[PDB]
Amino acid sequence: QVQLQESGGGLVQAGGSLRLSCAASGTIFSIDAFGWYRQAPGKQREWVAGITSGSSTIYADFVKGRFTISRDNAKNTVFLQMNSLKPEDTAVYYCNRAKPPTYYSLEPWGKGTQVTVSSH
Amino acid sequence: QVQLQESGGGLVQAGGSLRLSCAASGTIFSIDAFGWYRQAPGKQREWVAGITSGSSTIYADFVKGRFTISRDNAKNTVFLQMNSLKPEDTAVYYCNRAKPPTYYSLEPWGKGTQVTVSSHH
Amino acid sequence: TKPFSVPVLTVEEMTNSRFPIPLEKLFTGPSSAFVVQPQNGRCTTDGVLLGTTQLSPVNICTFRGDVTHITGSRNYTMNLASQNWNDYDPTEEIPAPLGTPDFVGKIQGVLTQTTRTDGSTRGHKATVYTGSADFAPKLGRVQFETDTDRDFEANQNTKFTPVGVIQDGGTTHRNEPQQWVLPSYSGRNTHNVHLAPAVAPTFPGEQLLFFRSTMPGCSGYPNMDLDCLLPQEWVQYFYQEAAPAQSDVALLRFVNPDTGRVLFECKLHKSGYVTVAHTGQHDLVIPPNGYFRFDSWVNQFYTLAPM
Amino acid sequence: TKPFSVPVLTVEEMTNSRFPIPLEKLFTGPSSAFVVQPQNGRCTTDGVLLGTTQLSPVNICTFRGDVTHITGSRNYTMNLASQNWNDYDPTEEIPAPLGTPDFVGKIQGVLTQTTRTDGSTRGHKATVYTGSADFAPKLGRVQFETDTDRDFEANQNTKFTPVGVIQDGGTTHRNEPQQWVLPSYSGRNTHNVHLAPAVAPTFPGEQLLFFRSTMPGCSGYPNMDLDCLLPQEWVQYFYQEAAPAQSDVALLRFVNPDTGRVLFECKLHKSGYVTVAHTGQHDLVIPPNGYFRFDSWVNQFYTLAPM
């Protein structure tokens, strides 16, 4: 079965940076495209970044220039590097198998990883 | 329009007593029958006690003479006197309008009142 | 002049006319001890719809309109619209909007909503209490108990999709729903109007034949039996065919199409219900490919062969 | 010899054949940017069901069977049964069980279960991901994402009732469901079998005519448009009538019964889809009592009157 497991979240200072990881098992990783998504309490879930099997990338306008998605096929892992963080980036972050070019997600979700950006 | 508002729950030791109250509005209280119900986490909600507009009473098998349902039409209030409490009685308790003779409930629920009975274990 | 008939469909190919689920089986039992007056699944053999009956089974026990939050609760009042979102007309000579539930019980499903400006959407578990004092679909108002006090917006299209029934306890299991108890369609202490009539066997030794399903249960120990007097497909067919009735009673044979063997016969009354010659409760055992076949118009003194 | 016809039913009286909701409107637009190959709502004019099409409106996008899960998981695998709870047979020459969803997207609804011994019941929010690698209804297995990891029992009858669709984000709103993208019915990296064919207009100036509904949305910003090639009632009617086709194209006129005026005409193709002469993307503005009327079999080169 497909399994998705995010890690790397925590409490970070505004303007800080951190890297999330997502291990995706149970599929043929090298032929899949992936996305990162986020959801804050009481808000709709939203897409933030996508990567093709060819390692071409695309970003939501509100993270462009700050976030970088990448992949390591040998590790079956997708990463999200998050720089210049703001309180509006606080959310649970999730990765998923995705369908380009619009990057709707395909599978039931993993548990996600909490990112909270302090306003102090 | 119908409102149901429970109070009187609490934490007690095995063998203790509580008195639950339920304030009902939005109906003609004096012609209604009422019931008490309870639900513990992960279990089905179940009926506890019923009272007719004539103030006749009837109880579930597990009550075994320990609880008394009554009504005060003047105050639009139903009561559940709860004696000889056991840990198995732990639950959120609710009152409702009910349909005799089987006492199924009729209305959306109030918030209920928590009863917790500790075991002197 | 157009000849009467019934559809060549098996029981399992057909649909309950009182809740949006397939038929499962045929059942007969005595019914002198309660009133049999359902309002959905009511149609004459010549195509006149009765009660709250409309044509598609997916609209049965659905509601649509705008919602307003009931302060101090997780509950919402729905102000009903028509199915096509036009204004509801409370002056039509019907008991309640077509497809309204016709029994007292707790119907659980999902209340969904779309915000028209951005197309954002939301959905919540919801229960309608059709025995509640405030259940008044004929006046255009019903209430839903939900799991939110904040998520539904005002003046936005909202829909309830039914799933099943629940039970919250009593002196016995299966004490609710009460499928033969009509709701008070305009709320507590009101007159129901424009009802399809109660039905009963009038011929000695006869009982009603019921087209039976099992409603999903969503919590508790509900009575999930649901009997309708006509399959929904028979309502749809009579409406379309509108064949004149040549007498008050159509004789049907239930036939195995592989062998041509007749399993039993029954009476389809012109006002839209079926009787069989049997005494007692009985689950009929039928070949799954069997179907009903209209054979003759008969007079008022026809004695059926025992079922 | 038996004359062909279509039902005298208005659009709003009829039902989508790809999800259990009423029809709302007629819609036409170009379709060269996509492959139009739905598997529900497929039937020839002489009554041969195609694809995954079956007769019951309420069984579309429903599933039944027993469930299992890995300890700690809120995801449950359903081992599919047939509609009547008999064993499912993966060797029948169909793409997937009749009524299986025929599009890629996320269908939310409710998973209900009854325990046979005592009649206890339970219901939980559940979503099926028909674009997931493990969605494999042709093999007899689908999975549901639920809000429990402990309440369902094994070897007890379990049903999924569909409510609506969801969306979880992307480069734009309304990027899923993809109503014209078939699922992989046997799961990832497998080829579909026994499909009803794709359809398209033939001649200059023609477009497909769709029978359109709006699916409920349960979260996010889903594309709720749902187009079927035939109303479910037309499937039911052609199956019942089985009138022989005298050519490959039936000419229908859409009529206002109050004035007798013809609003437009259209081709109903023998293999079960409709075309009109129009260039553009439009909902059709129709009188709500309008209906379709079969007028003539025509040759395959017939020129429709432009709308």
* Cα C307 to Cα D15: distance, rounded to the nearest angstrom: 36
Closest CA to A86 of A2, A23, A32, A14: A14
Q: Which residues contact D148 (CB under 8 A, 6 or more apart)?
A: D74, D124
| Residue D32 structural domain | 25-56+191-298
Same domain, D42 and D76: no
| Residue C3, domain member (yes or no) | no
Residue A93: CA count within 13 A, CB half-sphere? 29
Q: Any chain D CB within 8 A of the CB of A26?
A: yes
Enumerate the residues of chain A whose CB falls inside 8 A of the CB of residue D221. 44
Same domain, D211 and D269: yes
| Residue B73 structural domain | 3-118
CA angle (D41, D46, D48) in 5-degree steps: 50
Q: Where is chain C discontinuous (C–N over 2.5 Å), named by the preceding residue?
A: none
Same domain, C34 and C70: no
Indicate the SS3 state at residue A30.
helix
Q: How far is C56 from chain D (nearest CA, A)?
A: 7
Same domain, D52 and D107: no
* Cα A4 to Cα A32: distance, rounded to the nearest angstrom: 13
| Residue C66, domain member (yes or no) | yes
Residue in chain B closest to C128 (alpha carbons) equals B108
CATH at residue A73: 2.60.40.10
Tokens at residue D111, please? 């998973």
Using alpha carbons, list the distances in angstroms from residue C285 to C200, D53, D220: 23, 28, 48
Cis peptide before D306 (omega within 30 of 0): no
Count CB-CB contacts under 10 A for residue C297. Answer: 15
DSSP string, A74-109: GGTEEEEEE-S--GGG-EEEEEEEEETTTTEE-S--
Tokens at residue A94, please? 């999730």
Enumerate the residues of chain D whose CB falls inside 8 A of the CB of residue C120. 220-221
Sign of CA dihedral C20, C24, C28, C34: negative
Solved using:
X-ray
| Residue C249, domain member (yes or no) | yes
Asked if A45 contacts A58 with a C-beta cutoff of 8 angstroms, the reply is no
Using alpha carbons, list the distances in angstroms from residue C56 to B17, C18, C114, C160, D83: 55, 11, 24, 16, 20
3-class SS string, chain D: CCCCCCCCCCCCCCECCCCCCECCEEEEECCCCCCECCCCCCECCCCCECCCCCCCHHHCCCEEEEEECCCCCCEEEEEEECCCCCECCCCCCCCCCCCCCCCECEEEEEEEEECCCCCCEEEEEEEEECCCCCCEHHHCEEEEEECCCCCCCCCCCEEEEEEEEECCCCCCCCCCCECCCCCCCCCCCCCCCCCCCCECCCCCCEEEEEEEEECCEEEECCCCEEEECCCHHHHHHHHHHCCCCCCCEEEEEEECCCCCCEEEEEEEECCCEEEEECCCCEECCCCCCCEEEEEEEECCCCCCCCC
The verdict on a CB contact (< 8 Å) between D219 and C161 is no
The verdict on a CB contact (< 8 Å) between B46 and C171 is no
Residue with tokens 């019921």: C210
Residue in chain C closest to B109 (alpha carbons) equals C145
Indicate the SS3 state at residue B121.
coil
Resolution in Å equals 1.6
How many structural domains is chain B composed of? 1
How many structural domains is chain D composed of? 2
Asked if A90 contacts A116 with a C-beta cutoff of 8 angstroms, the reply is yes
Same domain, C30 and C78: no
* Cα C144 to Cα C142: distance, rounded to the nearest angstrom: 7
Tokens at residue C10, please? 């098996």
* Cα B121 to Cα D72: distance, rounded to the nearest angstrom: 30
In B, residues 89-118, which contact C (CB 8 Å cutoff)? Answer: 97, 99, 101-109
Distance of CA D163 to the CA centre of its chain: 14
* Cα B31 to Cα B54: distance, rounded to the nearest angstrom: 9
The angle that helices C232-241 and D232-241 make with each other, rounded to 10 degrees, is: 70
Chains contacting D (3 or more CB pairs within 8 Å): A, B, C
Q: Which residues contact B84 (CB under 8 A, 6 or more apart)?
A: B15, B17, B66
DSSP string, chain C: -PPP------GGGSB-SSSSSB--EEEE---TTS----SSS-B-TTS-B-TT--S-GGGTT-EEEEEEE-TTSSEEEEEEBPTTSSBP-TTSSSSSSTT---SBSEEEEEEEEE-TTT--EEEEEEEEETTSTT-BGGGTEEEEEES-SSSPPTTS-EEEEEEEEE----SSTT---BTTS---TTSSS----SPPPP----STTEEEEEEEEE--EEEE----EEEESS-HHHHHHHHHH-PPPSSSEEEEEEE-TTT--EEEEEEEETTTEEEEE--S-EE----TT-EEEEEEEE-TTPPPPP-
Task: Spell out where B40-90 has E strands.
Answer: 46-51, 57-59, 67-72, 77-82
* Cα D245 to Cα C45: distance, rounded to the nearest angstrom: 30
Residue in chain D closest to C62 (alpha carbons) equals D21
Q: Any chain C CB within 8 A of the CB of B65?
A: no
Buried (b) or exposed (e) across A42-65, using 16+ Cβ within 10 A? Answer: eebbbbbbbbbeeeeebbbeebee
Count CB-CB contacts under 10 A for residue C191. Answer: 8
Closest CA to D151 of D110, D107, D203: D110
Closest CA to C16 of C211, C253, C156, C225: C211
Tokens at residue D102, please? 């025929």
Q: Pairing mode, if any, of strands A10-13 and A113-118?
A: parallel
Indicate the SS3 state at residue A27.
coil
Indicate the SS3 state at residue A45.
coil
Enumerate the residues of chain A whose CB falls inside 8 A of the CB of residue D178. 104
* Cα D260 to Cα C142: distance, rounded to the nearest angstrom: 40
* Cα A35 to Cα A46: distance, rounded to the nearest angstrom: 11
| Residue C304, domain member (yes or no) | no
**What are the backbone dihedrals phi and psi of residue C35, each rounded to the nearest 5 degrees, phi first?**
-95, 125
* Cα B5 to Cα D178: distance, rounded to the nearest angstrom: 48
Residue A103: which region, alpha, beta or left (left: phi > 0; alpha: psi -120 to 50)? left
Tokens at residue C249, please? 């009673």
Enumerate the residues of chain D whose CB falls inside 8 A of the CB of residue C122. 217-219
Asked if D75 contacts D145 with a C-beta cutoff of 8 angstroms, the reply is yes
Same domain, D200 and D261: yes
Indicate the SS3 state at residue B87.
helix
Same domain, C17 and C75: no
Element containing residue B93 per DSSP (H, E): strand B91-99
CATH at residue C146: 2.40.30.120
* Cα B91 to Cα B45: distance, rounded to the nearest angstrom: 9
Indicate the SS3 state at residue A20.
strand
Same domain, C146 and C113: yes
Indicate the SS3 state at residue A62.
helix
CATH at residue C17: 2.40.510.10
Q: Pairing mode, if any, of strands A91-99 and A33-39?
A: antiparallel
* Cα C161 to Cα D62: distance, rounded to the nearest angstrom: 14
Q: How far is B40 from chain D (nearest CA, A)?
A: 14
D78 DSSP β-pair partners: D67, D142
D269 DSSP β-pair partners: D249, D273
The verdict on a CB contact (< 8 Å) between B1 and C134 is yes
Asked if D109 contacts D160 with a C-beta cutoff of 8 angstroms, the reply is yes
* Cα D203 to Cα D298: distance, rounded to the nearest angstrom: 15
Closest CA to A10 of A23, A21, A24, A26: A21
Residue C104: CA count within 13 A, CB half-sphere? 21
